[model samples]
Target: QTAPEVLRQWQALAEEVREHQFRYYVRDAPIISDAEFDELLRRLEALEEQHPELRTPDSPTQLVGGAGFATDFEPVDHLERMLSLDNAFTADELAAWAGRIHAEVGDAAHYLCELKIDGVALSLVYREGRLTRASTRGDGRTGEDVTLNARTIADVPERLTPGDDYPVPEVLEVRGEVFFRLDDFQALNASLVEEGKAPFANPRNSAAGSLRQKDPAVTARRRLRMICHGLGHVEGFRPATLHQAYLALRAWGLPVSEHTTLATDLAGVRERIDYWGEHRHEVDHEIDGVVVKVDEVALQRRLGSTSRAPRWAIAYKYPPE
Candidate 1:
């Protein structure tokens, strides 16, 4: 069901894009024009589009797919496997997701809202206030061991939280994104056009391409950053709400999202989503949509996850048609 050669090419293209993006978006210095990255992305997309079977979930075209180096990945057995959030692209779709969550979890359940940064999903494992490992979400159950590469990200923490109030867990997994700002993307594109190359597609492509570079030196040089959004697993302490857990992460020196909030209900969630979706382009990072989740830890556990995604959370998306 898999073609190794096709996969290898796809992986290489993904890495190349990431390196180019890092230099341009995060570091503010790009070797190639935006058109150069787009040419590369176009090639990869063409291959995937022509040969649909070769388009695996980890393919760059797929939002959930960012595992550029599959062979280097290590398998992770989670307390529960992390699942991909099913995307809701329209207002109607979001309304349906609201209805489904209400039916499944109940009308009183609160929602945790977070920005959908167009970036790579990286998993960091920390032990005793120190970073032990960093991995990409290869297939949810396993990921590429990018500890060295991630260390190069400007925003990622080399050490756990600085103060004593926030102690590192014996075992903890911090998950977040490695993204680029929109201004950078525009500049990159402008330069690419000057160089007679195709412009990069959008922020999502720019971020994904930059975060999956093969060489750590290339990644480090790109000035990439990270933000801790959620946890894969944690031992030693438990937080009441997803928001509280994020606060704990921020306290411990983990990079956290500035736009995250715990919504009172679906309407509040909708407002937050609308504000962000409208203004995301005006901000530094690329945001294709918003992610809404169950705030309560117990409710999250109760909802559990399916084979490919967490039932507790859903990605309420608004994409450019």
Candidate 2:
């Protein structure tokens, strides 16, 4: 057990870190550098480790700092279970993956290669052309309700685009990556230094930190952006392939990566992945890897999935810089 004074100090430290988390992640106005923020978290963690009684449910040590419960946000279950991707680190490994899939399915299969943007994963649900709810991919099964928080992002459209070509769905769940542009990230960090605070370690961390804020207005100030990569659930209409899903998402005024390519063969897929690795820094956002997916939804279903990841897709991670 801990003394009253020590427990009070621990609580105070937790509160301070929580406020700093809000400013850094939600407000996009950090007052400390990544190191400084980390030190605070580390200190709190040490205290909790030393005195187990000092730990609390709302403590920063309890969750991914700003990624869990927003005081204003509620808990939500994912419409569809969010699965993680298996990773390939080397070109040979990627090739082996392609070979394995080809052997099982066929060479005629088309692959869709997309930049694996380093960002937070989110699910946006639309009802009758209007944005209804937004959530984080918390545990793949359950997530925090961040609908109001997501509304602050300019990249998130309030309503799907109106057009003869685009059909409004009774229910639609669009999954995507949300991130800060490289330039924006630098600027934010610079501003933090100017304010005598610690800067974020990287854009990915910044994005995840920002999106989990308790205040929607704070999230709005961060200049967060998004690009739809896949779907979770659909009703009223169906897309036969992943490419068709991208087309529909684009027509709905939702964003998709312009760099996405349809690779007809293994060589084409490898070429695109190599090209992106060489030119990844040219993009406004950071991409640590490439995600290659079988284009046909039927093929993907046939391929099936493991407990954690889909067999139809693999994330080819670039060598560490």
Candidate 3:
């Protein structure tokens, strides 16, 4: 065979094999039969063996052998981009963030303080009160669609329950955290060990690995739960305050945090943050820090957001034990 022809055929076949591998390994959706996939891999290998130029260190065959699994979930754009909360590692840093907000929004009235739950961040879309699609918070702009696995979470309703006080928005994209309770993760990991499988490193990894399961049934058995924290995109009803939205999210039968507090001043916010640091374990989920957000929706809008984070909110992280 000619040099160009061989190279062309080899590159095309290698790419095809890679796509098929992504489906089989990461997405948990396989298109071709195992035999067909094997045949393609064999063809690619033959070319690589015949010509030294065809062999690459990062070839499809070596990649699979080198790294265990690679994710190739369907890339989906978020309806409204998610913003990261800027973090303060110290009390001084925390005060500095508050000062920046004060300079921008002109004296805050109250701040909403919440536990920043350590888990997998997700965006769940509901249209006409039906759960449409669920995705991970991948790069804020684009995420992987894990709707099938999300449906398995009992906390995430297949259809939204109408509320007496707040009407379900015509289109609502609820931001939530999908996580494993410490006990649940322990139980699941124990079972995996019993079956002679490697244990998940931690709850966060367990949740992420569980969500990407090819079978929704596997995720269901993992006992992952969710708590709604923020909103992505909305239509119809819009709350004037972030706190008001939490109450409305509760009314809509979404799991909003019960431990949220409204602080009148920075001192009160500090007090709450200190208290949570001591009692962090008392709550079911892991809390790495306390997230403080300007309570007023207007103030939040005025404060605006940076390319990476919202200026209106800051996470005061606790020192590690």
Candidate 4:
């Protein structure tokens, strides 16, 4: 059993981490840098690991990698559970994660590497070819419906473009990030500060705050953009690999990250991750890390997932600037 003082300390740290996650993911206004936030989480995780009895369902360590839900918007259940990706901050950690996969399933693994956009996760559901609903990834299992607000974004196609190569699904739960370009965020903050309104801490917070506006017109004025990375549930068909899925998504008129690439083996993965770490500043939007996932859908299925994250994918977070 854990000492009372240790448990109390753990609780306090958990609350602090939860508040920071809320500020970062829900509010998009992180006061701390990525390194500071990661340290807070590491502290909480260490505490929990040291004293298993100290762990709680509502503990910061137990939840998926985001803050709480927004109360103003209508709540909606997700078609599939939105699990968080486990993080790797160093080459050794990345190698360890990859090593586990190699040990379990053997070598010859290929991966898809994409910019991990620092933005809010949203689910866009389309019925037939038309947009039906959009929502935030609130608490993973459920989310706040923001269809009206999402409709205002020009990048979010109201209807899927018909393609012979990839037919539109009758029902598609498209998952992606709604982010603001760095230039736009800076200009937005300038205007806000000029008007005597509080400026957002970063582009992510501004994007999230903009997306959760009570008025659709307000969201439109903010000029939020989107980039679809994957899907939740689809009715019409399935893609063989994540690479195929991304291609099909792009063909269907959804936006996808321009820097997405294919990496064969851990060596290639390491090179890409390192390359992005140095060149992340060149992108229009802010990217905190690289998301590496197994390209083979079948192998992904075989590797499976933990309660919190998929075993076949990992987020290689960059060092804080």
Candidate 5:
């Protein structure tokens, strides 16, 4: 396509994607299907990448949660910038990504593998083991404050309980995904349809819409759950490995997924990806891919990251089922 063609495509695609997001987030009425919404946004990003000139500050690609028109919720800062994971959508793609990590970290590094849940990435900050702040992953730096609404989720821990191995960290920021189980998701859809309201397109879209509610009571009524994946900005505690941190987090009363496994080599990592690719639907929640990260904190820091994604981790997405 010519330059003018690319420019015009970005213009329309960006605007349409923004409209879809506005309806999904603020209006609580989604106008597009989830796959449709994803493709528009994904295509918008593709155009920006193919033509870097399109990556202006005003693009929806730069914003988070489409926090474009704000309401009762105020904007807040994340303790650490939340970078996205690089994707590996094919066998060769995963091998290349896995090979990169293997070359950098060598045999000494362990890989932490987990199912990539289709949900909203949330930041829950705890000061003195007490939940103080909760927000969304807006623009990687700022997010919508949803503290009261987050407190209503039964899976979220109000205060961390001390375990025998480690004391509660004085200041801890728990990063996790908030989602609806299949059963609960279906029930909510049924209830919405009964009340003459439009149902959500997918659990992921609904989870985001349900989380940014104007009323905490309305959010409380929905069945929301969380499973912590990572940590940020901690004080008065230290852990050697990411998986071990999960251990401490689980013992400290935080909800952690039991499906996570530590792979000692790249071969083990491949087995994990293949296993989940076949059994992805066996879990209670929806999973879109498999996430692999270097378990060692030192190795992760060494691997570093680019402007938008970490080099230490990669998400292997299966072909659309």
Candidate 6:
């Protein structure tokens, strides 16, 4: 049996690990050696083995890659096509977006801004307040169903909050990213070093590869998290804009990132991007850019969908390097 001191020490270290993970992934800043972090995890696992009662489902020690079960995926078509945003590399391009919004709207407007998470594009189908299916953004029109794999994410709530206050849709499709925080990615690599396995290139690949694995159980082992950014094929909810839909997603228990902001114009969007770029290292997750979308439903309809994207939305991205 593990001594009380051992359990106490394990719990303390586990909390520290959690804090560290958030600091590195959410804040993009880290303060400890990779090896030091690994030792804490190793110690926690040993304690759990000796004192099974102390092992919690949410424990940091459970982050292991899955053994993978082979399963076939089904192709699905999007009710409303998932569109790509036009790119804007330079601040000048962002300024142009600002100018265009005013020109098109015939007035200055606010904007909603958010960090574009560097991960795979995914769509989740939720029915009756429960997650039913998940799919990849294969080609904007069709995707491979990955419901089984998506369930493994710890932060992806199985049940969503439903209410008469905000109309619950009969069918709702939530689109977002699945990614591993840097600390978890680093931890995985640390373990791989000992096992002689090659480390994944980055968190995006780590998450995408994990979800695409043949087995759901294997996917569950990877420490993946998600944030729902858009709504597709909604039968029920009534949000005034794309931004409202994002808010509703969070209210429904989806883990939307805290980095999003409501900007009324392109300048506001640019401001958000600049802020994150300067403070991104403090976050633990990887971010490559910002997503800027028109906030009002009416405006979005007017902007409409182009051949490849919504005229209402564009990915205003910044470089990671």
Best lDDT goes to which candidate?
5
TM-score of 5: 0.77
Which stretches in model 3 have alpha-carbon errors above 4 Å?
A: 1-72
Q: For each candidate, what TM-score against the reference?
A: 0.70, 0.76, 0.77, 0.76, 0.77, 0.75
TM-score of 3: 0.77
Q: What stretches of model 6 exceed 4 Å from their correct place?
A: 1-70
Q: Report the C-alpha displacement of residue 30, candidate 6, in angstroms.
A: 34
Between candidates 1 and 4, the one scoring higher on lDDT is 4
lDDT of 6 by residue, 1-321 (tens): 348787678779877776555434433345688688777667778768877877776676674212122446789877778876788888887788767777878553457777888888888888887777788998898998777677667677656887545656788888888888899998887877779988888788888887887666567667888888888888877788766676677677787878778876565676788898788788888888888877887777776787887776767676646
Candidate 1 structure lDDT:
0.73
List model 1 lDDT by residue over 1-321, tens digit each. 257777787778866765555455434556787577778877877878867875666555564222343224355544335567888878887788788878877866798888887787888888776777887787777777777677667777667765465566788877888776767767767866897978779766766665666655555555467877888778876888888887778887778878788887889988998898678867677677889998998888888777878877889777564
Candidate 1 C-alpha error for residue 52, in Å = 56
> For residues 96-120, what per-residue lDDT tens digits would candidate 2 score against the true structure?
9888898889975799999998899
Write down the RMSD of all candidates, one decimal each. Answer: 14.3, 13.5, 11.3, 18.2, 17.1, 12.5
* Number of clashing pairs per prediction, in order: 9, 9, 0, 1, 0, 27
lDDT of 5: 0.86
Better of 2 and 3 by lDDT: 2
Better of 2 and 3 by TM-score: 3
Q: In candidate 4, residue 69 scores what lDDT?
A: 36
Q: Kindly give the stretch of ten consecutive residues in candidate 2 with the minimal lDDT sum.
A: 64-73
Superposition TM-score, candidate 1 onto the true structure: 0.70
Q: How far out, in Å, is residue 173 in model 4?
A: 1.1
